């Protein structure tokens, strides 16, 4: 009664090879599930993290290379364009011969980089303001500095777009880095050295005189600025509540509650907003509604910005763009990045050009590349089986509502309503294969030259920003996919109340029609549950069936949610991570992801039970002394076989809202009674704590 098939052999062999059966499952299931992988694999020099998940992404890149690298004669223009973009990107010889000239010729159009110019104040005396300089970077080049203005969906009216104001991202991965001591010292040193190196290269290329003292003085001043900005930003822990984040005022209310004076100004919000919107010939009233996500940050900005010179501000502002551009220039410029990215990521070498290039084209043409990818790589009747799994787990979520004692009846029935309304999106949009016109038209105004990679990427930034901005008065497109298909990941949108499973994730170990269903449910089953449960985590629970930010909870249930979930904040908050130097996880910042994991795996397990019930026990896998309950958990865990560079562990513990793979497994399975059954775990077994968290 062993399954003997081709596909069973492959599955079994992968499971066997990953696991370490000399470890007690009940002491450390991660080591049990993954210890074999961990012995045999080192992290590649180009990887900051590595494991079964990242291997799928490497393998997807190979597919993208195959489909992009050879011109075909039947290729529609949209595909011609992805291929030409790929070609421009992989031509290092062309790129190296251009030096930094493409940057140099760009710099004027963003009001310069003063450290890298002569007499900067006099050049731009006539023209420069903070309003204009921020707005050009934002609107033509999509770089958000000092103040992030962006058109997005209205949280409280999901069918419309509003202007948003928010705090900007920083040059370093999180606000914590700007302590610049201990585990953060090298990053800060490398960061500022990086600035200096690039300022030097630009000067040398312009044939200007180099004063190392002045360079250090101006870039250290840049760092002090950003340090202050970093300290002014709101913590993530204070940004978790979408109701608190949503403060809609008019540009007038903003002008008068959030004044800034820059270089002796003061700052005209009306003017700022219009310098951006005019890019696309739209005109804005002082009476325009704006959703301000970062009130206290704007308030805290006031005393900081006054202190600094125009020269300081623009030194930071241009640096933040130039940062992103150097690796698209010649080798010498690429090289200047090295210590910075090692410090942040642990990597000692650049990822292969063809991989970076394939990823870049995919990022900018995800429908064209998605089309090519699915033609190569993706079945057909996968779509329908997954459709079935999603039916099943949606129904399990609903069903579970009755067992759940921390909600009252109106709230439970509201949760049901939201559950039923969730719109699923599987594999890829038919559109991109069966409608050539529509796919050509998406990229109509794009025109790439194969010798002009840098102009190509600049074109993409301009086009991207212009499209986004002109959405202000347009309605949100219900049908539009929020991911390309060539993506190893899955998604929930609170705004669309939508779950999304790109073709890229619908493969082993998550899914195959030919692998055991224990594996499918423990794999993709648990992913579906994770995405659905995002609809009901500490963010998503705040949005209703239509994607609108609206309270549908009673005070009691709202309070009980918080109380139930506080258990997981404490639990994961209590994990210490060696790779990050013994630091504890942020149990608050990972909560939503942790809630989704625990809910998700529960739901998937119960759906598999409902399946075994109706259909029967399935045949065992050869070479494995486990039953299918046990394999279910085995596979769920092996999704996350892998490990981290210490430099990236320090990064991720602050910037990833997901727990690290190992703690995802331990966390969730500590909360699973079913797991402890399956592996016969003693009470107070490390893997079977007596006290367990439960939300969903
Ligand atoms: C591999 C890893 N992915 C993940 O764990 C899961 C997939 C997974 C699950 C289980 C095992 C392995 C992989 C994806 P995921 O849901 O985490 C996704 C990146 N996240 C989202 O879809 C966002 C959530 C939610 N929609 C949300 O935050 N929203 C929606 C509207 C605005 C807003 C905000 N703020 C990863 O991406 O690192
Ligand atoms: C790279 O670009 C240069 C442009 O100077 C061109 O001469 C060469 O043929 C290109 N190489 C490839 C492989 O496209
Ligand atoms: C914004 O103000 C500047 C200040 O000089 C002015 O020159 C410019 O025309 C204004 N732009 C808009 C969009 O009103
Ligand atoms: C660890 O758990 C205890 C007990 O709930 C809690 O008081 C403590 O704050 C937790 N540690 C963290 C950082 O979450
Ligand atoms: Zn998630």
């Amino acid at each position: 009664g062993i399954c003997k098939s081709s596909d069973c052999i492959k599955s079994a062999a992968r499971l066997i090879q990953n696991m370490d059966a000399t470890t007690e499952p009940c002491t450390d299931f991660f080591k049990y599930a993954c210890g074999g992988w961990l012995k045999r694999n080192v992290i590649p020099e180009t990887s900051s993290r590595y494991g079964n998940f990242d291997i799928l992404r490497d393998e997807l890149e190979v597919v993208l290379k195959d489909v992009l690298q050879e011109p075909k004669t039947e290729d529609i223009v949209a595909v011609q364009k992805a291929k030409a973009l790929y070609r421009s990107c992989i031509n290092e010889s062309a790129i190296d011969s251009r030096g930094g000239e493409p940057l140099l010729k760009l710099l004027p159009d963003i009001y310069g980089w003063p450290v890298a110019t002569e007499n900067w104040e006099q050049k731009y005396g006539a023209s420069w303001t903070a309003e204009k300089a921020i707005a050009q970077l934002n609107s033509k080049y999509g770089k958000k500095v000092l103040i992030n203005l962006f058109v997005g969906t209205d949280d409280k009216n999901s069918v419309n777009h509003v202007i948003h104001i928010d705090q900007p991202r920083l040059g370093l991965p999180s606000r914590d880095y700007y302590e610049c001591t201990g585990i953060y010292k090298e990053a800060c040193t490398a960061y500022v050295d990086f600035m200096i190196s690039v300022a030097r290269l630009i000067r040398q290329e312009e044939r200007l005189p180099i004063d190392e003292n002045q360079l250090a003085l101006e870039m250290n001043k840049v760092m002090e600025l950003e340090k202050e900005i970093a300290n002014a930003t709101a913590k993530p822990e204070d940004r978790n509540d979408p109701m608190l984040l949503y403060n809609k005022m008019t540009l007038a209310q903003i002008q008068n509650n959030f004044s800034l004076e820059i270089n002796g100004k003061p700052f005209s919000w009306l003017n700022f907003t219009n310098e951006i919107m005019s890019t696309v010939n739209i005109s804005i009233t002082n009476e325009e509604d704006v959703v301000v996500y970062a009130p206290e940050y704007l308030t805290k900005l006031k005393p900081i910005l006054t202190k600094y010179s125009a020269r300081d501000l623009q030194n930071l502002m241009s640096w933040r763009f130039i940062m992103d551009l150097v690796s698209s220039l010649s080798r010498t410029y690429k090289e200047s990045r090295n210590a910075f990215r090692k410090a942040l990521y642990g990597t000692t070498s650049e990822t292969a050009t063809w991989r970076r290039c394939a990823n870049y084209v995919n990022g900018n043409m995800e429908n064209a590349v998605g089309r090519l990818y699915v033609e190569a790589a993706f079945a057909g009747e996968s779509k329908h089986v997954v459709e079935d799994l999603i039916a099943q787990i949606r129904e399990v979520f609903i069903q579970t509502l009755d067992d759940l004692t921390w909600m009252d009846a109106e709230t439970k029935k509201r949760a049901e309503e939201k559950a039923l309304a969730i719109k699923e999106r599987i594999g890829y949009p038919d559109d991109i294969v069966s409608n050539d016109n529509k796919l050509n038209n998406e990229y109509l105004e794009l025109n790439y030259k194969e010798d002009e990679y840098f102009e190509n990427i600049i074109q993409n930034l301009k086009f991207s920003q212009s499209k986004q901005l002109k959405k202000l008065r347009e309605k949100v497109d219900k049908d539009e996919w929020i991911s390309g298909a060539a993506v190893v990941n899955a998604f929930y949108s609170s705004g669309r109340n939508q779950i999304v499973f790109p073709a890229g994730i619908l493969q082993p170990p998550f899914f195959s029609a030919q692998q055991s269903n224990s594996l499918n449910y423990g794999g993709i089953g648990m992913v579906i549950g994770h995405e659905i449960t995002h609809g009901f985590d500490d963010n998503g629970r705040n949005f209703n069936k239509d994607g609108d930010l609206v309270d549908w909870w009673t005070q009691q249930s709202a309070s009980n949610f918080k109380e139930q979930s506080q258990c997981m904040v404490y639990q994961y908050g209590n994990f210490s991570w060696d790779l990050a130097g013994g630091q504890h996880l942020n149990g608050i910042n990972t909560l939503g992801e942790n809630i989704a994991d625990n809910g998700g795996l529960g739901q998937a397990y119960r759906a598999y039970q409902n399946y075994i019930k109706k259909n029967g026990e399935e045949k065992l896998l050869p070479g494995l002394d486990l039953n299918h309950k046990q394999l279910f958990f085995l596979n769920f865990a092996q999704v996350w076989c892998g490990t981290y560079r210490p430099e990236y562990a320090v990064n991720s513990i602050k910037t990833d809202v997901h727990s690290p793979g190992n703690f995802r497994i331990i966390g969730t399975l500590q909360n699973s009674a079913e797991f402890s059954e399956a592996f016969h775990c003693r009470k107070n077994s490390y893997m079977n704590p007596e006290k367990k968290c439960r939300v969903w």
Side-chain angles (χ1 to χ4, degrees):
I2 319 284
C3 177
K4 245 148 289 218
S5 91
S6 263
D7 306 294
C8 282
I9 286 3
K10 287 152 135 183
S11 293
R14 181 266 297 182
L15 285 157
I16 299 160
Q17 280 154 15
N18 283 336
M19 73 188 305
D20 168 23
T22 81
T23 285
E24 172 53 46
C26 290
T27 293
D28 190 342
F29 197 68
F30 183 63
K31 202 180 139 112
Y32 177 74
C34 288
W37 190 93
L38 255 1
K39 191 211 99 112
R40 298 190 208 186
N41 298 270
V42 191
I43 303 160
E45 293 304 292
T46 52
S47 290
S48 68
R49 181 190 72 205
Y50 203 61
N52 285 159
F53 198 69
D54 295 296
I55 288 170
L56 290 182
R57 296 180 166 182
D58 288 2
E59 270 161 18
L60 183 145
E61 279 163 1
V62 173
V63 175
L64 292 194
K65 184 205 202 272
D66 288 351
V67 299
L68 290 166
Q69 72 184 341
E70 237 173 290
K72 288 213 62 159
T73 268
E74 300 306 87
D75 276 352
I76 62 168
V77 160
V79 160
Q80 285 171 49
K81 291 195 167 155
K83 289 179 181 199
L85 183 61
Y86 184 69
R87 284 190 308 259
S88 72
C89 177
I90 64 161
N91 202 326
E92 302 199 13
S93 131
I95 286 159
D96 278 323
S97 76
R98 269 141 183 87
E101 155 83 352
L103 216 212
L104 294 176
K105 109 206 314 280
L106 180 107
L107 248 5
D109 197 48
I110 61 165
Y111 289 98
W113 199 24
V115 61
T117 329
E118 48 222 334
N119 286 296
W120 175 88
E121 281 87 359
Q122 255 287 323
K123 267 130 196 39
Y124 294 99
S127 45
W128 193 94
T129 67
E131 284 107 330
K132 275 201 273 177
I134 301 164
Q136 259 275 93
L137 269 170
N138 171 296
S139 69
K140 236 165 88 144
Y141 299 104
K143 181 46 66 154
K144 320 305 191 92
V145 291
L146 300 195
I147 304 157
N148 187 9
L149 175 352
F150 72 87
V151 187
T153 292
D154 195 322
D155 296 315
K156 278 198 217 247
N157 212 317
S158 61
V159 329
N160 294 295
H161 303 141
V162 226
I163 291 168
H164 288 27
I165 300 282
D166 206 352
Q167 60 194 32
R169 300 163 138 156
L170 305 161
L172 293 177
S174 79
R175 65 198 308 278
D176 315 80
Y177 272 71
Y178 289 89
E179 314 170 34
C180 291
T181 59
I183 66 189
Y184 302 118
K185 178 151 149 150
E186 166 71 25
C188 283
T189 305
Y191 187 43
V192 161
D193 282 356
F194 184 24
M195 301 174 197
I196 288 173
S197 284
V198 175
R200 199 161 36 225
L201 283 167
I202 297 190
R203 285 220 145 222
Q204 292 175 165
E205 200 156 358
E206 287 300 358
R207 249 85 145 238
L208 309 184
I210 257 87
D211 178 336
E212 292 294 337
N213 274 176
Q214 189 60 193
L215 283 192
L217 191 96
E218 270 191 79
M219 296 307 90
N220 284 318
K221 169 91 339 129
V222 162
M223 183 57 146
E224 192 46 84
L225 216 211
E226 199 179 31
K227 263 185 201 176
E228 289 202 82
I229 295 164
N231 179 239
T233 59
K235 278 179 241 235
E237 292 102 318
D238 293 329
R239 285 160 68 70
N240 47 356
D241 187 333
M243 288 287 207
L244 289 198
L245 260 228
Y246 188 91
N247 308 269
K248 159 126 69 174
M249 45 202 79
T250 65
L251 273 190
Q253 302 186 78
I254 287 162
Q255 184 62 41
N256 282 105
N257 289 50
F258 296 124
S259 56
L260 304 179
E261 136 160 56
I262 314 299
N263 210 230
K265 230 349 192 116
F267 181 88
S268 180
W269 286 93
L270 179 55
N271 187 242
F272 180 47
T273 290
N274 270 304
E275 282 281 323
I276 280 169
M277 287 320 300
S278 57
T279 289
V280 88
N281 185 269
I282 288 173
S283 87
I284 285 322
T285 299
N286 243 80
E287 298 109 56
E288 189 69 4
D289 279 344
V290 177
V291 180
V292 183
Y293 273 167
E296 290 128 65
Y297 165 77
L298 288 189
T299 292
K300 288 184 221 162
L301 221 45
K302 194 224 195 24
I304 291 160
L305 256 24
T306 67
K307 282 193 297 220
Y308 289 89
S309 69
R311 157 167 220 102
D312 298 321
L313 296 176
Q314 186 72 47
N315 265 168
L316 173 54
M317 274 189 291
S318 293
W319 168 240
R320 288 285 290 105
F321 193 28
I322 290 165
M323 264 182 81
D324 286 359
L325 290 180
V326 154
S327 82
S328 301
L329 296 169
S330 71
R331 187 5 167 270
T332 299
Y333 280 91
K334 278 189 226 290
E335 281 172 12
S336 69
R337 222 194 147 232
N338 278 348
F340 181 64
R341 77 131 205 294
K342 180 178 173 231
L344 271 52
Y345 297 110
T347 50
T348 55
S349 155
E350 253 179 7
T351 284
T353 280
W354 69 260
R355 295 182 177 271
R356 276 172 13 246
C357 287
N359 281 336
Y360 174 86
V361 293
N362 192 23
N364 285 265
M365 300 189 71
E366 59 226 297
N367 287 329
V369 177
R371 172 201 174 100
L372 295 162
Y373 173 73
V374 295
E375 286 174 352
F378 184 66
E381 311 283 292
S382 26
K383 189 149 159 141
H384 296 136
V385 174
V386 166
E387 279 180 21
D388 205 79
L389 304 180
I390 288 162
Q392 264 164 64
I393 291 152
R394 183 207 306 267
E395 182 64 17
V396 169
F397 176 96
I398 284 150
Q399 278 185 353
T400 291
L401 283 181
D402 303 10
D403 299 304
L404 280 190
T405 59
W406 55 268
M407 308 170 65
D408 53 55
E410 47 192 293
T411 292
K412 282 187 185 187
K413 169 230 304 298
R414 247 81 145 247
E416 175 154 9
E417 308 179 12
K418 213 208 148 133
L420 299 165
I422 283 164
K423 246 267 208 124
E424 88 239 47
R425 298 298 240 240
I426 310 171
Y428 65 91
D430 261 282
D431 274 337
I432 61 171
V433 185
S434 71
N435 196 337
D436 288 355
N437 275 150
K438 182 190 167 175
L439 189 58
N440 285 334
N441 284 333
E442 210 193 317
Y443 311 108
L444 233 207
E445 294 183 89
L446 291 187
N447 222 228
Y448 300 135
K449 330 197 204 121
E450 313 200 0
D451 54 311
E452 263 8 290
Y453 173 59
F454 200 89
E455 283 86 13
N456 289 170
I457 72 164
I458 297 315
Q459 211 193 131
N460 284 345
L461 299 170
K462 286 176 175 167
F463 169 98
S464 187
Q465 276 304 90
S466 157
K467 211 174 267 207
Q468 198 48 27
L469 283 166
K470 96 208 322 38
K471 296 219 244 177
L472 184 47
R473 300 301 187 217
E474 299 305 331
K475 244 195 235 156
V476 173
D477 192 345
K478 339 169 72 57
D479 266 43
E480 175 185 339
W481 275 57
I482 53 157
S483 177
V487 171
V488 187
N489 220 343
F491 301 101
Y492 173 81
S493 178
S494 46
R496 293 159 186 258
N497 195 208
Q498 184 170 286
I499 56 184
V500 195
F501 312 88
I505 197 161
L506 301 178
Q507 54 170 316
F510 295 100
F511 175 69
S512 153
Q514 280 78 46
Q515 91 186 346
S516 314
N517 280 310
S518 68
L519 307 172
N520 283 327
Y521 282 81
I524 202 67
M526 179 272 152
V527 171
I528 292 141
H530 174 104
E531 308 316 326
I532 280 158
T533 302
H534 267 330
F536 307 96
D537 73 19
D538 59 328
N539 168 267
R541 89 176 180 81
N542 284 284
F543 293 81
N544 81 180
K545 73 206 227 301
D546 303 322
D548 293 319
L549 185 59
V550 93
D551 200 341
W552 50 269
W553 296 70
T554 69
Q555 266 116 91
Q556 202 44 253
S557 301
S559 171
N560 291 3
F561 177 92
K562 285 187 187 123
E563 240 187 88
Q564 295 301 128
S565 57
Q566 186 59 217
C567 180
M568 290 177 182
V569 169
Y570 282 161
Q571 172 191 18
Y572 284 81
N574 258 257
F575 293 135
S576 78
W577 196 10
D578 41 11
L579 298 182
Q583 279 189 99
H584 283 60
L585 304 186
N586 197 310
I588 287 159
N589 289 343
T590 45
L591 172 56
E593 294 302 332
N594 294 335
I595 282 166
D597 277 351
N598 282 277
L601 176 90
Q603 289 142 187
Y605 187 66
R606 277 175 248 118
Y608 180 51
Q609 284 176 320
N610 290 349
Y611 165 85
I612 280 195
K613 212 190 285 245
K614 122 146 40 121
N615 285 293
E617 224 150 291
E618 52 196 341
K619 304 191 151 252
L620 298 171
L621 286 185
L624 284 140
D625 290 311
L626 300 170
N627 65 40
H628 268 288
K629 310 219 164 299
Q630 308 180 319
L631 287 171
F632 169 98
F633 296 105
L634 218 204
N635 196 231
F636 154 76
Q638 277 191 4
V639 169
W640 284 127
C641 292
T643 185
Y644 281 75
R645 287 193 182 269
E647 293 98 342
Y648 191 58
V650 165
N651 188 332
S652 199
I653 204 166
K654 293 296 185 308
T655 56
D656 199 353
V657 290
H658 309 92
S659 298
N662 59 313
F663 289 118
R664 290 181 86 161
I665 295 143
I666 291 168
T668 63
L669 303 175
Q670 279 180 335
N671 290 327
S672 182
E674 285 65 49
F675 163 84
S676 300
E677 209 265 316
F679 294 90
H680 306 121
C681 288
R682 284 146 143 189
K683 349 137 236 205
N684 283 337
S685 246
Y686 180 71
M687 294 300 303
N688 184 20
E690 222 283 350
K691 181 219 192 347
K692 292 189 195 315
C693 303
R694 182 89 188 258
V695 48
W696 298 108

